[PDB]
Structure 1
């Protein structure tokens, strides 16, 4: 007998993030996984990935240049952070 109890009795206004998982039992291959339940990606860059089988096989001339240079601003308050009876403010 497998028995799981999470947050059986709750009272008084909480702020919660819950994730419960119960289990009982070519270039890239993956099998029966769980990925990115709570994931935050910001300013993620990928350039070349899995081009293919035998690319640029013979006599290839490649010039690769990656320029990542710009005025960018990211302002975040309370990222993945639950709060209660509090105050959050962003002033510019």
Structure 2
């Protein structure tokens, strides 16, 4: 007998991010995968991935140049941080 009881008595006004998970039992392969329960990506860049089988196999000349140079201002007050009876703010 598998019993799971979570947040049974929520009183007043709490801030909660609950993620309950119960389980009873050619190039890339993923099986029985759980992902992104609470994934947060900012400025994530993948230039080349999984090009393929036999890419540039023979006589190949390749020039790769990656220049990251930008005035980007990523300003996040709260990330994955539930709050209660609080004062949160951003001032510029």
TM-score (norm 2): 0.97
Alpha-carbon offset, residue 59 of structure 1: 0.4
Gaps of 5+ in 2: none
Once the two structures are superposed, what CA deviation does each residue of 1:36-75 show, in whole Å capped at 9, x if it has no partner?
Answer: 1101000001001011100101100111100101111110
Alpha-carbon offset, residue 20 of structure 1: 0.2
Gaps of 5+ in 1: none
Q: Distance in 2 between matches of 1:36 and 1:8?
A: 25
Q: Distance in 2 between matches of 1:3 and 1:54?
A: 51
Alignment coverage as a number of residue pairs: 92
Aligned-partner SS, 1:29 = strand
Decide which structure has greater strand share. 1
Q: Tell me which stretches of 4 or more aligned residues in structure 1 moved more than 4 Å.
A: none
TM-score (norm 1): 0.97
Once the two structures are superposed, what CA deviation does each residue of 1:9-44 show, in whole Å capped at 9, x if it has no partner?
Answer: 111111111100001001111101100110100000
